[PDB]
Amino acid sequence: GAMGSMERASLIQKAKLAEQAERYEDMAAFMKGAVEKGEELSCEERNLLSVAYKNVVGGQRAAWRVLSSIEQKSNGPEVREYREKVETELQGVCDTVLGLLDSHLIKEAGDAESRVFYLKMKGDYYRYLAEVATGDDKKRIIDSARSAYQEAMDISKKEMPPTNPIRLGLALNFSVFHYEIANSPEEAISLAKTTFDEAMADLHTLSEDSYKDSTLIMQLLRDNLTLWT
């Protein structure tokens, strides 16, 4: 692609610059380019990838919801046309990310910390597709997300401690999937409570710095449980 001629390390440097400048489309373009060099990513490099695309797709999702709500209220073609335009861009980004995970990040990820991170991302980007799906593939999209999340969960439960931030962020996300996408609110609540309680019981093993990382995500679980119960 367009980043083919730039050095892997230069792309990573520039992703970090872009992040500081709040230039998240540039950030995502640079990390895409880094990924396409074909080497595995470090922990920090995985984080840069996720943050970039998360920021990009976040703007799209928020814009989609504004438009969709206006469209719902109105029920000429402009509102639907423009909502369709934003939706198609959002779908494009999700497709791009899924593309990177399938070609070939997931298949080369053997470590629990890499594998679970990528499979969570897979579940997330299918979840983003699900939020805007109304067609005959809606069910398959949902099952793709569920399947990605579950494989991640199984690995995380066998291979990581209950306080592992990756495992925690996966469970948070999978619980919201359950609540909101799968229409399984009891499953959502059950997962979020179990996850919180098992984390709680493992905190005693952590350094002050690990303690802060874990409890931050645990508080997110708590926030959702408060809304849900």
Binding site: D124, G169, L220, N224
Partner: peptide, 10 residues
Amino acid sequence: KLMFKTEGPD
């Protein structure tokens, strides 16, 4: 839309 907490940035 009431959005629930999910991992990472907004």
